[PDB]
Design a protein around this ligand. Structure first.
Ligand SMILES: Nc1ncnc2c1ncn2[C@@H]1O[C@H](COP(=O)(O)OP(=O)(O)OP(=O)(O)O)[C@@H](O)[C@H]1O
Ligand SMILES: Nc1ncnc2c1ncn2[C@@H]1O[C@H](COP(=O)(O)OP(=O)(O)OP(=O)(O)O)[C@@H](O)[C@H]1O
Ligand SMILES: [Mg+2]
Ligand SMILES: [Mg+2]
Lengths: 47, 485, 376
C-alpha cells in the first residue's frame, strides 16, 4: 500500500481552460475564450 | 582544484579487494589448497639490534638466579592439559570443527598450557597419528583494529593480503563451501577474547559460527578472563555457540607455586660456584662459594602469593626481587662494580613482599609543606562540621583564615602569619589567598589526593578527598603544630 | 574407534542425517504449505520464523534448500506437481557491512551481465518487476539500526516487509530471527523437550553400529537440558563431555552425566576457608554497603576503622593491607571489584567494592563466631 509509505510517484492515465460558462450555463464558448484572452492580456500587461 | 582540507599523511596498505569466492569459476573448480605453495604458510628484523661488546660483564652468583626466575625461561597443569589435548586431538582426527573455551585469572598458565598442547599436537602430527594442521595465534590486544584478526587469519591460511571485509568473506567462503578433502585443519588460538568484543559483536559471532559449519575443519581455542564473559557481554547466539563445557584455570595453591619455583631453581639451588674475589664473576661447576635459597622463604612467598592471586608471575617476581635485594647488599658490602655461603634469606623475601604493601600516601603527606597541611586540616574540619564529603574552596579559604586568626597566640602561627599573608614583606599587601595557595592546590591535585570540579568560579567550586579520611588524619596527627590546635 | 565417531557425531558441526528433521515435522509441513501457497499462486507474502538458539531453524531450512531445491534458479515440485522455476537464495546478515545494503545483496545473489547500483528498495522493485524470487534472511536482527529512534531503527526492515506486501511483484521473504535477541505470517520453533531430544539423539547416532550410551543416561541428560531455553547444542556438549570424562578417567551411565554437570558448573564453603581477620573485613564491607551502596574502597576502609575503635577486636591495619584482604576475597569470589565513574559534582573514575554473595548463608556463618556479631 502506497498510502502506508512516505513518498510515492504516480503517473495518471489520459484518454482546455479552467473558465466556466456563466449566465447559469447560457453563455457561449466564444465569450469564455474571449474572457480568457482578455484576462491574460490584462494580467501580462500588469505583471 | 582548491581543497577544503588535506590528508597529507595517508598510509595505505597494498591489500587487494577481490575475495576468495570470485577467483574460481565454481565450487568444483577449486584445486587442492594443501598442494599449493602460498597456502598454509608453505623474520628479517633480527639483525638490527646487535652490536659488538668490548667489556667482559661481571655476572655474580645471584645473576643466574635472577635470569632463572624470568617468565620467558608444567608440574601443576595436567588435567587442563589432558582436557584440551583430548578435545583438540579428537577434533583433528575426526576432521571436526569445535570450540574449546578456557578462562582464568592472570598468570595461571593458560597460554603456556595451550601452547604446550599445540606443540604436542604438532609432535603427534610429525610422526603421523593425526592429519597435518595449521596453527594460528591471534591476540586481541596486539591488534590495532579489532577487524585486523580477519586480515591476520586469512593471511595465515592463503598467504594473500586483503582488506578486512574481503578477508571476512574469503574466510566465510573457505569455511562454508570448500570441501574437507580439499583443505587442511586449522587450529586458531584467540587470546585476550574480551579485546575482540565490539559493539555489534560481528567478529565474535563470525568466529564461533564458523565452528558450527560442516566443511570448516576449524578448531577455535578461546582464552578469556572469566567464565561468565559470554553470559555478560555476548548475545545468546554466541553464548549458545561457545557451549556449556567451559574450562576453568583456577589459581595456583602454595604447593604448586613452590613446585614451579623449585623446578626453576632445580640445578642451581644448594650448588657450588667458582667466584673471583677481586671482581665477583661466578662460574658454575678464586673461592668455591655455596649458593642456596631457603625453602622456608620460597614456601611463605608461595603461601602469600597463592592467598592473594595464585599468579605464577607474581611468585617468580617476588623471588627475583628478593634475589635482587640480596645481590644489592652483597655488591654493596663487597665493593663490586659493573663491567663462603651465599643465601637468599627469608628477610629478603619479606622485604620484597612488603615493598608493594607499604603506603607512601601518609609518608607523602607527612613531608608536605605547612600550607598544604593547613589546606588538608581545614578541609578535614569542614568535613567534620558540615559532613558533606565535598567542600567549596571559598569555605576552605575562610576556614584557613579562621584557623589562623583564632590561634593567634600560638608561637608558630605568630611567626608564620606574615609569611602566609604578606610573604614576610612590607610593601606587599594583605592577600586574600595564602602564599602558595594554587601551588599546593595543584600539588594535591597532581598527586591524586584531591578531586576538583570543573568550574570557573573559584569560590563555589567544590573539592573532594580522593583518599580515605583516617590516613589523612593520621598524617595530620604526626605534625607538632596541627596537633596542638 | 567408536568413541571418536560418536564424538564426531556429537559435535555442533556434524552432518544432518523425506526431507524433514526428526522432531520438526509440523514446522516443516507448515513451511512447505507456505511455499506451495506462495509459489503456485505466484503471490507476494512474507514469512517470519521465531525461535530460541539451537532449535533447528537453520538446520531445517538448509535441509529444505538442500533436498527440495539468472543464477539460483531451481526446479520445484508442486503438490499438483508439474514443475516450477524459482530463484531461492539464503543471505546471512552478519556478513553484511551495512544493513541498508541488503537489497544489493539481494540483487547480487540472483544475477550473473549488467551491474546497477541498488541503494533503496525501489531499484529492487523495478528489477524484480518485469518477472518468482525467495530470499531467506537469516540473523535478520542485525538489520535493525543501533542508536536510532524506534521509528528509524525499524526503518529498513519494514521496507523489506512492505515490498513483500506489494501487488505484481514476485517476492517471497522468509525471515529467520532469534527471539532472545529481539503483517507477515509467524512460525515459531518451540524449544525441544526430553522425548524429542531422545528421538533426535537415537536417530542421529543410528548410523553408528554400537550405542555407547545407556538410554537412561540420555534421558537424564535430555531432562537436565530442558525447560525454558532448551538448547540441543547444550545436550550435544553434555554427551561429548561425558565421553571425554569417561576416556580421561580410563557403556556410559548416569554418573558420568552427573560428573559433567558437576565439573562444568557455594558461599558457605568460601567463608569457611577464611581466617578471623578476613571474616572481619567481609563483615565491615557489607555493613558499609548498606549505608552507602555506592562506596569506594577508601570509604569502605573508612567504615572499618570506626568499627574497630568501638570494639578493640584485633589490631587495626593499614589501608594497603585492607586492599590486600579485599584482593584475597576477590580471589575467593566473595568480592567483585570494579572501576566505574562516580556521579557527584566531580566526575572521575574510582574503584568500588561490590558483593553478590547469598545473604542467607552469610548471617549463619558469622553468628557462630561471637566476636564478629558486633559487626553485623
Ligand atoms: N604451570 C606452570 N609451570 C611453570 N611456569 C608457569 C606455569 N604457569 C605459569 N607459569 C609461568 O608464568 C608465566 C605466565 O603464564 P601465562 O602467560 O601462561 O599466563 P596466563 O594464565 O595466560 O595469563 P594472562 O591472562 O595474564 O595472559 C609463564 O610464562 C611461566 O613463566
Ligand atoms: N531437529 C533437529 N534434528 C537434528 N539436528 C538438529 C535439529 N535441530 C537442530 N539440530 C542441530 O542442532 C544444531 C543447531 O541447529 P540450528 O543451527 O538449526 O539452530 P538454530 O535454531 O538456527 O539456532 P540459532 O538461533 O542459534 O541459530 C546444529 O548442529 C543442527 O544440525
Ligand atoms: Mg596469556
Ligand atoms: Mg540459525
Amino acid at each position: 500500500a502506497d498510502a502506508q509509505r512516505s513518498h510515492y510517484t504516480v503517473y495518471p492515465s489520459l484518454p482546455h481552460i479552467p473558465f466556466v460558462k456563466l449566465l447559469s450555463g447560457k453563455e457561449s464558448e466564444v465569450n469564455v475564450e474571449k474572457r480568457w484572452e482578455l484576462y491574460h492580456q490584462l494580467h501580462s500587461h500588469f505583471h | 582544484v582548491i581543497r577544503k582540507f588535506t590528508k597529507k599523511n595517508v598510509a595505505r596498505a597494498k591489500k587487494k579487494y577481490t575475495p576468495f569466492s570470485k577467483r574460481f569459476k565454481s565450487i568444483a573448480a577449486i584445486p587442492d589448497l594443501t598442494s599449493l605453495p602460498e597456502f598454509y604458510g608453505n623474520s628479517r628484523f633480527e639483525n638490527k639490534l646487535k652490536t659488538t661488546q668490548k667489556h667482559q660483564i661481571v655476572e655474580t652468583i645471584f645473576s643466574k638466579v635472577k635470569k632463572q626466575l624470568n617468565s620467558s625461561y608444567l608440574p601443576a597443569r595436567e588435567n587442563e592439559f589432558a582436557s584440551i589435548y583430548l578435545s583438540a586431538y579428537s577434533a583433528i582426527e575426526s576432521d571436526s570443527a569445535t570450540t574449546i573455551y578456557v578462562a582464568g585469572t592472570p598468570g595461571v598458565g593458560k597460554t603456556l598450557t595451550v601452547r604446550e598442547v599445540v606443540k604436542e599436537l604438532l609432535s603427534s602430527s610429525a610422526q603421523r597419528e593425526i592429519p597435518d594442521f595449521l596453527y594460528v595465534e591471534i591476540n586481541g590486544l596486539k591488534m590495532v583494529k579489532p577487524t585486523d584478526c580477519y586480515e591476520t587469519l586469512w593471511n595465515k591460511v592463503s598467504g594473500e593480503r586483503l582488506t578486512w571485509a574481503a578477508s571476512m568473506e574469503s574466510l566465510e567462503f573457505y569455511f562454508k563451501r570448500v570441501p574437507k578433502n580439499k583443505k587442511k585443519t586449522i587450529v586458531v588460538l584467540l587470546d585476550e577474547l574480551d579485546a575482540m568484543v565490539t559493539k555489534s559483536q560481528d567478529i565474535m559471532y563470525n568466529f564461533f559460527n564458523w565452528t558450527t559449519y560442516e566443511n570448516a575443519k576449524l578448531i577455535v581455542i578461546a582464552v578469556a578472563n572469566t567464565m561468565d564473559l559470554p553470559e555478560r557481554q555476548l548475545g545468546n547466539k554466541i553464548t549458545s555457540r561457545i557451549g556449556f563445557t567451559r574450562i576453568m584455570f583456577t589459581g595456583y595453591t602454595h604447593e604448586e607455586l613452590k613446585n614451579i619455583i623449585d623446578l626453576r631453581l632445580k640445578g642451581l639451588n644448594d650448588s657450588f660456584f667458582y667466584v673471583d674475589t677481586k671482581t665477583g664473576n661466578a662460574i658454575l661447576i678464586v673461592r668455591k662459594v655455596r649458593l642456596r635459597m631457603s625453602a622456608d622463604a620460597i614456601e611463605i612467598a608461595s603461601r602469600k602469593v597463592a592467598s592473594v592471586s595464585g599468579d605464577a608471575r607474581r611468585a617468580l617476581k617476588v623471588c627475583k626481587r628478593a634475589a635482587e635485594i640480596a645481590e644489592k647488599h652483597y655488591m654493596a658490602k663487597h665493593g663490586y662494580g659493573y663491567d663462603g655461603v651465599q643465601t637468599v634469606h627469608i628477610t629478603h623475601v619479606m622485604k620484597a613482599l612488603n615493598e608493594t604493601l607499604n603506603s607512601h600516601v601518609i609518608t607523602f603527606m607527612t613531608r608536605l609543606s605547612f600550607t598544604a597541611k593547613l589546606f588538608i586540616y581545614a578541609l578535614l574540619n569542614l568535613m567534620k562540621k558540615n559532613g558533606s564529603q565535598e567542600q567549596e574552596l571559598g569555605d576552605i579559604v575562610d576556614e584557613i583564615k579562621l584557623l589562623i586568626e583564632v590561634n593567634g597566640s600560638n608561637k608558630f602561627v605568630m611567626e608564620i602569619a606574615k609569611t602566609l599573608f604578606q610573604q614576610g614583606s612590607d610593601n606587599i599587601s594583605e592577600q586574600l589567598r595564602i602564599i602558595s595557595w594554587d601551588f599546593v592546590l595543584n600539588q594535591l591535585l597532581d598527586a591524586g589526593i584531591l578531586f576538583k570540579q570543573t568550574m570557573k568560579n573559584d569560590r563555589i567550586c567544590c573539592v573532594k578527598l580522593n583518599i580515605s579520611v583516617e590516613e589523612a588524619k593520621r598524617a595530620m596527627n604526626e605534625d607538632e603544630t596541627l596537633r596542638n590546635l | 574407534s567408536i568413541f571418536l565417531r560418536t564424538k564426531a557425531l556429537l559435535q555442533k558441526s556434524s552432518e544432518l542425517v523425506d526431507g524433514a528433521l526428526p522432531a520438526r515435522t509440523a514446522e516443516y509441513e507448515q513451511v512447505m504449505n507456505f511455499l506451495a501457497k506462495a509459489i503456485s499462486e505466484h503471490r507476494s507474502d512474507s514469512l517470519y520464523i521465531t525461535g530460541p538458539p539451537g532449535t533447528g531453524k537453520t538446520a531445517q531450512l538448509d535441509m529444505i534448500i538442500r533436498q527440495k531445491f539468472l543464477q539460483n534458479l531451481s526446479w520445484f515440485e508442486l503438490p499438483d506437481g508439474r514443475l516450477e522455476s524459482v530463484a531461492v537464495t539464503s543471505i546471512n546478515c552478519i556478513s553484511l557491512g551495512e544493513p541498508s545494503s541488503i537489497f544489493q545483496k539481494i540483487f547480487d545473489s540472483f544475477q550473473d551481465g549488467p551491474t546497477l547500483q541498488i541503494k533503496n528498495m525501489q531499484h529492487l522493485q523495478k528489477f524484480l518487476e518485469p518477472y518468482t524470487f525467495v530470499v531467506v534472511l537469516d540473523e535478520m536482527d542485525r538489520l535493525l539500526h543501533a542508536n536510532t529512534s524506534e521509528t528509524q531503527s525499524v526503518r529498513t526492515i519494514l521496507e523489506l516487509f512492505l515490498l513483500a506486501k506489494l501487488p505484481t511483484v514476485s517476492f517471497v521473504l522468509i525471515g529467520m530471527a532469534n527471539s532472545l535477541d529481539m503483517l507477515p505470517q509467524t512460525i515459531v520453533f518451540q524449544p525441544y523437550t526430553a522425548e524429542q531430544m531422545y528421538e533426535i539423539v537415537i536417530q542421529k547416532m543410528s548410523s553408528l553400529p554400537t550405542i555407547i550410551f545407556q538410554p537412561m543416561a540420555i534421558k537424564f541428560a535430555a531432562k537436565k537440558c530442558a525447560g525454558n531455553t532448551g538448547d540441543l547444542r547444550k545436550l550435544f556438549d553434555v554427551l561429548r563431555g561425558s565421553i571425554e570424562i569417561y576416556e580421561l578417567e580410563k557403556k556410559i551411565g548416569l554418573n558420568y552425566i552427573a560428573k559433567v554437570f558437576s565439573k562444568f558448573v557455594s558461599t558457605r564453603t568460601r567463608i569457611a576457608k577464611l581466617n578471623i581477620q578476613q571474616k572481619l573485613i567481609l563483615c565491615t564491607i557489607i555493613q558499609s554497603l548498606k549505608l552507602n551502596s555506592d562506596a569506594t574502597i577508601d570509604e569502605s576502609f573508612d567504615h572499618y576503622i570506626k568499627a574497630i575503635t568501638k570494639t578493640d577486636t584485633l589490631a587495626p591495619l593499614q589501608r594497603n593491607e585492607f586492599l590486600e584482604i579485599c584482593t584475597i576475597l576477590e580471589t575467593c569470589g566473595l568480592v567483585s571489584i570494579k572501576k566505574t565513574k562516580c556521579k557527584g559534582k566531580t566526575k572521575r573514575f574510582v574503584d568500588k567494592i561490590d558483593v553478590d554473595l547469598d545473604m542467607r548463608e552469610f548471617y549463619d556463618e558469622m553468628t557462630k563466631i561471637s566476636i564478629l556479631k558486633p559487626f553485623l
